[PDB]
Amino acid sequence: PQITLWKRPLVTIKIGGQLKEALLDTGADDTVIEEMSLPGRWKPKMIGGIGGFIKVRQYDQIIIEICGHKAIGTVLVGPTPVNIIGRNLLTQIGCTLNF
Amino acid sequence: PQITLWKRPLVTIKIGGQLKEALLDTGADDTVIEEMSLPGRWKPKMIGGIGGFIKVRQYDQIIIEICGHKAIGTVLVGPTPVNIIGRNLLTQIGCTLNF
Numbered sequence: 001p002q003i004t005l006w007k008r009p010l011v012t013i014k015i016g017g018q019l020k021e022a023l024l025d026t027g028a029d030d031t032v033i034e035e036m037s038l039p040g041r042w043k044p045k046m047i048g049g050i051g052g053f054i055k056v057r058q059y060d061q062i063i064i065e066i067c068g069h070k071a072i073g074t075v076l077v078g079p080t081p082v083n084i085i086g087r088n089l090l091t092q093i094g095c096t097l098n099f
Numbered sequence: 100p101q102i103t104l105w106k107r108p109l110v111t112i113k114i115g116g117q118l119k120e121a122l123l124d125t126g127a128d129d130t131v132i133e134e135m136s137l138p139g140r141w142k143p144k145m146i147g148g149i150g151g152f153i154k155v156r157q158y159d160q161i162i163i164e165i166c167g168h169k170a171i172g173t174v175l176v177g178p179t180p181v182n183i184i185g186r187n188l189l190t191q192i193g194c195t196l197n198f
């Protein structure tokens with residue numbers, strides 16, 4: 001699809017068999033999702049945003065569908081205000097910016 | 100242009116007669132620039148994201164040049180770690196997400 005930016009670029013995602021809304025976010029290096037249960041071991045990560053830094057749990061090789069496109073990659077879990085799909089998965093789905 | 104997302108989508112902008120590097124950020128509602136002088140009236144605003152909120156100064160009707168494209172809109176100024184071009188100006192340059 002082509003997504004204009006007059007509104008927030010929110011899409012449906014599927015992760016752990018559940019549907020969530022997430023924001024396609026070219027300003028985010030990584031993908032960060034609100035508290036949920038994911039399989040496997042996690043490792044620590046600190047991520048920094050507009051307000052400062054938060055601690056998150058890093059899960060690798062997680063299956064996620066983004067607006068109907070399958071990705072498999074790193075997903076961070078923690079106190080984000082919004083589920084965000086960052087460049088690590090945007091690249092997997094072939095997402096580009098165009099003007 | 101078509102901008103891939105293998106790396107941070109950084110561009111050169113001209114604002115207040117100054118050249119700055121800034122991030123094309125589809126997850127940002129607004130445009131926020133590191134401390135600088137801008138002409139005209141301003142009002143305080145709180146902006147939030149990962150790690151919480153910061154206080155900024157809101158300037159309206161500011162002209163910016165982004166990759167050769169002129170646009171006008173609100174620009175926020177304050178302690179952002181990165182200059183961010185948000186949706187209020189990305190729309191004006193005809194920037195879309197495509198996959």
Ligand SMILES: CC1(C)SCN(C(=O)[C@@H](O)[C@H](Cc2ccccc2)NC(=O)[C@H](CS(C)(=O)=O)NC(=O)COc2cccc3cnccc23)[C@@H]1C(=O)N[C@H]1c2ccccc2C[C@H]1O
Pocket residue numbers: 023025026027028029030031032047048049050052076081082084086122124125126127128129130131146147148149180181183185
């Ligand atoms: C969807 C959100 C709410 S959460 C993430 N987000 C966004 O707009 C995101 O694209 C931000 C943009 C940003 C880049 C760099 C520094 C700070 C912030 N990016 C992020 O939150 C991500 C988190 S990560 C590492 O993937 O897990 N950080 C990054 O990619 C890289 O951050 C950094 C890079 C370099 C130096 C840094 C120093 N100190 C902190 C962060 C740094 C939205 C938001 O904050 N929006 C607010 C915003 C932002 C700018 C202007 C106005 C407003 C209002 C809100 O719309």
